[PDB]
């Protein structure tokens, strides 16, 4: 199937084992911004759900399907590939909604639905939006979507902005310099210092930060879930040209994402921006191997290229330069194995 052709089995096993834990469902459900906004978007656009056929891709415990029932959905197909689908069935029964919510265990690329749907709901956003490659399953599910049907969320915006964080940059070498000693219990470890440095710089940093570290208006790359195909996510090239609002050393790029539910009544926004209350997605930062000095008013141009891999994630290539000076830096990061620096 489409899913197994793009995913190593070892990665898929551990991925769905994670989502089989009720504690991980609880972690996302307790995110009030996340859970509340989804509920708000669905209820306040009740006409998009009243007496409609709904598809829920990766329903987990099924919370979004219950929201669709609250909004008056006639029939809800809730697909979940992890063993959490068995718990969704239990909740459907205990909430007397067996006549309206049909749980289908399995991958959305492999299960079979008996009819097309009017609207597809899902939470396919990983950190930095694209991790997990669930957006491709969400788009793949459009084979079940009736023409002129809708999708909740409707669009996704990933934001990139340059940041300065001297402490963050220097702590990489502070951690790697453990290896820079000539007699650790009589052993000289200095030969591995370079490998330690590189290992840390391959890790995106998942945590939050004060918005004052940002040095330019973010650049926005939009994915329109109604129009896009899943092939559009195998290679995501994000060109950027930042107009520097402050002068300082740029240590890397900061990432967050917004998502919109464009309903017939209104549009509701779920945002993980650092200017908003923190969510369980936090924010993601990718360091440059070397910092770039940029005067307030310069332009910092380059590309961020995300290449999908069979570990349900992306390899991140970033190149950037200060156009006015020509100073260049880059970095190559593995999004599948970030560093959770948040305290």
């Amino acid at each position: 199937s489409v899913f197994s052709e793009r995913t190593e089995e070892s990665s898929a096993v551990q991925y769905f084992q994670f989502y089989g834990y009720l504690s991980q469902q609880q972690n996302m459900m307790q995110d009030y911004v996340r859970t509340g906004t989804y509920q708000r978007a669905i209820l306040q656009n009740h006409t998009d759900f009243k007496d409609k056929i709904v598809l829920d891709v990766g329903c987990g415990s099924g919370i979004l399907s219950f929201f669709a029932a609250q909004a008056g959905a006639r029939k809800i197909y809730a697909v979940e590939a992890s063993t959490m689908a068995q718990h969704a069935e239990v909740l459907v029964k205990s909430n007397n909604l067996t006549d309206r919510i049909v749980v289908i265990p399995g991958k959305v690329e492999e299960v079979s639905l008996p009819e097309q749907v009017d609207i597809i709901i899902s939470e396919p956003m990983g950190y930095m939006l694209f991790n997990e490659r669930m957006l491709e399953s969400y788009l793949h599910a459009k084979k079940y979507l009736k023409p002129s049907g809708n999708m909740f969320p409707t669009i996704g915006d990933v934001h990139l902005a340059p940041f300065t964080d001297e402490q963050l940059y220097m702590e990489q070498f502070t951690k790697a310099n453990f290896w820079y000693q000539p007699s650790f219990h009589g052993v000289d470890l200095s030969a591995l210092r370079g490998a330690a440095v590189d290992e840390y710089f391959r890790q995106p940093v998942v945590d939050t930060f004060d918005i004052r570290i940002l040095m330019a208006k973010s650049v926005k790359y939009t994915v329109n879930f109604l129009e896009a195909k899943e092939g559009d996510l195998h290679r995501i090239e994000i060109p950027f040209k930042f107009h520097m609002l402050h002068s300082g050393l740029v240590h890397g790029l900061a990432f967050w994402f917004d998502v919109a539910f464009i309903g017939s009544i209104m549009t509701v926004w779920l945002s993980t921006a650092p200017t908003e209350p923190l969510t369980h997605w936090y924010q993601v930062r990718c360091l440059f191997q070397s910092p770039l000095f940029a005067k307030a008013g310069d332009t910092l141009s380059g590309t961020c290229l995300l290449i999908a891999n069979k570990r349900q994630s992306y390899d991140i290539s970033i190149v950037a330069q200060v156009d006015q000076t020509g100073s260049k830096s880059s970095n190559l990061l593995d999004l599948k194995n970030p560093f959770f620096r948040y305290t």
Binding site: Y15, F18, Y19, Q24, N27, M28, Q30, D31, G126, Y127, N131, E132, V206, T279, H280, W281, Y282, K336, N337, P338, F340, Y342
Partner: peptide
């Protein structure tokens, strides 16, 4: 590493 970071 976990797909969805631990949150509170």
């Amino acid at each position: 590493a976990a797909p969805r970071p631990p949150f509170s």
